Scaffold this active site. Structure first.
Site, PDB file in Angstrom:
ATOM      1  CB  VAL A   9       4.771  -9.046  46.971  1.00  0.00           C
ATOM      2  CG1 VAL A   9       5.262  -8.397  45.682  1.00  0.00           C
ATOM      3  CG2 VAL A   9       5.238  -8.239  48.184  1.00  0.00           C
ATOM      4  CG  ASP A  96      11.864   2.257  45.079  1.00  0.00           C
ATOM      5  OD1 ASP A  96      12.532   2.857  45.959  1.00  0.00           O
ATOM      6  OD2 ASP A  96      10.768   1.695  45.312  1.00  0.00           O
ATOM      7  CB  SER A  99      18.036  -3.767  51.204  1.00  0.00           C
ATOM      8  OG  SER A  99      17.446  -2.652  51.853  1.00  0.00           O
ATOM      9  CB  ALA A 100      12.682  -3.570  50.411  1.00  0.00           C
TER      10      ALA A 100
END
Length: 240
Positions: A9, A96, A99-100
């Site tokens: 990213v 999935d 928090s990330a």
């Protein structure tokens, strides 16, 4: 941005199966895909940038950002569940939730991201087990594929929101955050002992109410967990 380890990213401001899950589109609590780049060996996906990064990075105060208030943490939880609800109403499984993969916009709105592992529903078994161990439900680690696994993972997220602690940390006891549910249920500790110390506005009543949802979410028998529409109701009732 500090990626996990599959699909990098990189930073009109932008962040450079996932496209099929975009097809549906138009939701406030899901990240927005502007475009993509397929012509080449490498494959890119272009999204509307999230200036306040992930929920993990904000819970850890990465780069010296101020700790999130309880007030913003209730808004984030409420918002992330609306995002998961839209996925489930549209018979999709995130696979999935963590928090990330909960990003934050100019106004700290929770936006779910990374739908590469996502599967349409529209229970299945798989030989290619995927997700983040520390967040995965027992059945997901065993190959099952069910929306129910997203609810368990969302339960770990609520514990990260309440406690400010990462789902896993080797330099800790218990090293896996989800174990704290048992410490509390077996009355050694209490949820008050685990509340993030980096907050001035978190009242015991609403914290406990969020934890009650977290405990329901973290149910081991997959059919005893609440559905996302029930999780939304309990989180909206929390504020109220």
């Amino acid at each position: 941005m500090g990626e996990g380890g599959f699909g990098v990213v990189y930073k009109t401001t932008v962040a450079v199966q996932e496209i099929k899950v975009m097809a549906k589109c138009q939701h406030e609590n899901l990240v927005e895909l502007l475009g993509f780049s397929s012509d080449g060996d490498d494959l890119c996906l272009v999204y509307v940038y999230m200036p306040n990064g992930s929920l993990l990075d904000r819970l850890s105060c990465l780069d010296g950002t101020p700790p999130l208030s309880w007030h913003m943490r209730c808004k984030i939880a409420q918002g992330a569940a609306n995002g998961i609800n839209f996925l489930h109403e549209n018979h999709h499984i995130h696979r999935d939730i963590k928090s990330a993969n909960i990003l934050l916009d100019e106004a700290f709105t929770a936006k779910i991201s990374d739908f590469g592992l996502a599967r349409a529903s529209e229970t299945v078994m798989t030989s290619r087990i995927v997700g983040t161990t520390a967040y995965m439900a027992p059945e997901a680690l065993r190959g099952e594929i069910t929306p129910k696994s997203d609810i368990y993972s969302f339960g770990v997220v609520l514990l990260e929101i309440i406690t400010g602690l990462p789902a896993v940390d080797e330099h800790r006891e218990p090293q896996l955050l989800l174990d704290i549910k048992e410490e509390i249920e077996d009355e050694e500790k209490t949820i008050e002992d685990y509340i993030d110390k980096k907050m001035n506005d978190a009242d015991s009543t609403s914290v406990e109410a969020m934890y009650s949802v977290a405990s329901q979410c973290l149910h081991e028998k997959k059919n005893k967990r609440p559905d996302i529409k029930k999780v939304q109701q309990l989180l909206q009732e929390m504020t109220a």
